[PDB]
Symmetry: C3
Subunit: 313 residues, 3 copies
């Protein structure tokens, strides 16, 4: 049965807007733990990581808050590796996606053979040298790829990092806003991806069939799902820092996760970029969090066709 390890990560210095550090709060008050337990889920809450304050953290070239970001991920990596050693699926209620660096890092320490599925409107694969924004939530994957070692300069706060995944161990789904440098990296490293164009062409059904086959083809291995809230259309998750029109639908979002759950291989989960303060109205915030919870519950068994206990009703 799916045993979960909850990790609240109220961090925002991976991007300019601040309300994202409130993500764990709103998701918890939405009753996420209760609802997960309302299922057959064994849930242990490891709490909200107390993220230090690094007042002295000047830019590294154009890269912003490098020491703060580097420290949050280093802290998070230890936590994630802790829950993984406790035999539970790590659920990181995040702030910004920069935390992916620590989440996937800590997960790989315990399961070096993990495969990653990255649901996002963006690739977040900019290097400190290709980024034009300097925001680290758009650079996580670059720190994690072994093939990019030698192209990632020494950024204050990330000396603890060691690339744990190969370009062949990750699949993107939902892309619709990729920088030119990021696109160059995609095609150069031969990274497997399904942009909104491929979802439109093939259908989410075929997309998931190919994604799982691609990652679990040679052999079965742990799965790390890093779900960026903006991967879904802004009509479903408006309270997010960088929304892009024409995203994955609510149904597609649930299909992605229902399928992953069914592999029985989900090992790590990230629910990122939910920023309640960016909701233009009280219900945009409610609509976003509700959708984020729904997708989280899907990862752990909630099926739209229904569920029932091993009893004769």
């Amino acid at each position: 049965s799916r045993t979960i390890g909850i990790i609240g990560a109220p961090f925002s210095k991976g991007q300019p807007r601040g309300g994202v550090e409130e993500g764990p709060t709103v998701l918890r008050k939405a009753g996420l733990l209760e609802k997960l337990k309302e299922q057959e889920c064994d849930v242990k809450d490891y709490g909200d990581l107390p993220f230090a304050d690094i007042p002295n953290d000047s830019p590294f070239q154009i890269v912003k808050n490098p020491r703060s970001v580097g420290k949050a991920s280093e802290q998070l990596a230890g936590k994630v590796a802790e829950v993984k050693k406790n035999g539970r699926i790590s659920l990181v209620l995040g702030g910004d996606h920069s935390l992916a660096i620590g989440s996937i890092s800590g997960h790989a320490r315990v399961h070096p053979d993990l495969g990653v599925i990255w649901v996002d409107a963006h690739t977040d694969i900019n290097t400190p040298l290709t980024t034009t924004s300097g925001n680290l939530h758009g650079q996580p994957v670059s720190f994690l790829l072994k093939e990019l070692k030698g192209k990632i300069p020494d950024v204050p706060g990330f000396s603890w990092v060691t690339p744990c995944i190969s370009a062949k161990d990750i699949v993107y789904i939902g892309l619709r806003d990729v920088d030119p440098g990021e696109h160059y990296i995609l095609k150069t490293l031969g990274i497997k991806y399904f942009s909104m164009t491929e979802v439109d062409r093939l259908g989410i059904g075929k997309v998931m069939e190919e994604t799982l086959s691609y990652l679990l083809g040679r052999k079965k291995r742990p799965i790390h799902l890093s779900f960026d809230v903006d991967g879904l259309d802004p009509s479903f998750t408006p309270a997010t820092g960088t929304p892009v029109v024409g995203g994955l639908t609510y149904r597609e979002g649930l299909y992605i996760t229902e399928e992953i759950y069914k592999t029985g291989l989900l090992s790590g989960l990230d629910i990122m970029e939910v920023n309640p303060s960016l909701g233009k109205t009280p219900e945009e915030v409610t609509r976003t969090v509700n959708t984020a919870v729904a997708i989280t519950l899907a990862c752990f068994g909630l099926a739209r066709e229904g569920n029932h206990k091993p009893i004769d009703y």
Copy 2:
């Protein structure tokens, strides 16, 4: 040509909210009869069933308004069997889905070999003993299935009922909120269904291909379509008692019905759960009724590709 028999069924005691008894009214004033006639439809209106008032109708265990519900369906069954004997397709403009009991019952009296397609966000297959809500609009199918005879206790008002369909003669489409007892019944009786997950996986095209093949495989037989308005997403039909996000789209709704029409086998039709009083704004009511009419017109020939008469334009 599609000859129709209209039956207004202003009934609401199958669920707690009352505005649903206004369904026939708003659908008629939307010009449904005129529009149907604006097509090549032969339409005879059998009127709005005068539903009796049963002041004395205490709960049966937890089941609410059993005598009122049982009587409305018994009345409706006779009407439907009447129009079927008049060689016309029964169109039941309903209130709540509890009326399905009488609609399908009366239809089967004349055509015991009918197949049922149930478009709904719910299975409505709870028994008086599995229901937790006590609302009869979520129990109709349980009264109709032969295999469940022996599990349906004697509820005041339904002694006239006799299960007329087998688990193999029904197909669900659109499910996204099924109780645990209902899910147990689905898998136990081996009922064929396409939840939103299957629609996402296969596409409405394949879904309809399999549905009709499944029901008309061995041989051609009359079709009864019980369309619950909440089977479509609440962005299309918001004025309904129990809306559930992530529903069938407008297009899918029309595709379902255009395909059924084309079989030339539509024998019975239910348009249920439209509740004008639940629309939060005047246009939510207009948007709901408009969609309900559009889907009704599709059942009787209106095609999105166009239609034309046997003349040289």
Copy 3:
């Protein structure tokens, strides 16, 4: 590389509502030229056609403003043929779709072998004798089809017209509101089309596969894409004269154009029916124009998966 020739066509007398003549304006101020240049596009703006005023233009039977419409298209045809001779893809920022007559006409003068893809909720194939509205924006295709020569009476202003395409050289996508006479013409001339029903059945992926195969089967030839803004659902392009619910999605709209771009055969493009004055709110106008620009940029290379230059990033 895609070299473009911009042609502003502020014309509205092809239909009753007037704000459509503002289409070139809002599209230009949305930064369309800048954005196209922000790509690898060679853009030359031929300006906004100064459309004459024909005060004396009484109806022809029921056909409205025939001389004004006929003159605008005649003018436009010369312009389009001019840009085509300059070796550039004609981009007609239009007013109403009646301009299609001149756009496709002028294009065919230089490339008589062109194939047409018509994205629209309507067929716009009514003849002066089949039309019931008398509005010429719903009759363009009838003037262009060789097979309909002999059925198009002499309308003041169109004596310069000479049917340049056969029924076999055009494909419709998005149809959902076709008159009976139009439908008769579709089936009689055996015109290939994909109404919303076919998109629902096959998926936009298969639809585009069949469309391009159909038109480029025997051999490769120039493509003329006449994109009517109302071909997309009104939730994306509300500021348009004749919206119809259940249209093509934003994603589908981009998929259509991304695919066409990739053929490397786009030869002519029409962006029609954008009417800023019909937007009920300031953002409905913004949402419409934004979508119209997005689809225009897709026609010329902008891909959702990303783009990059031939350099080592």
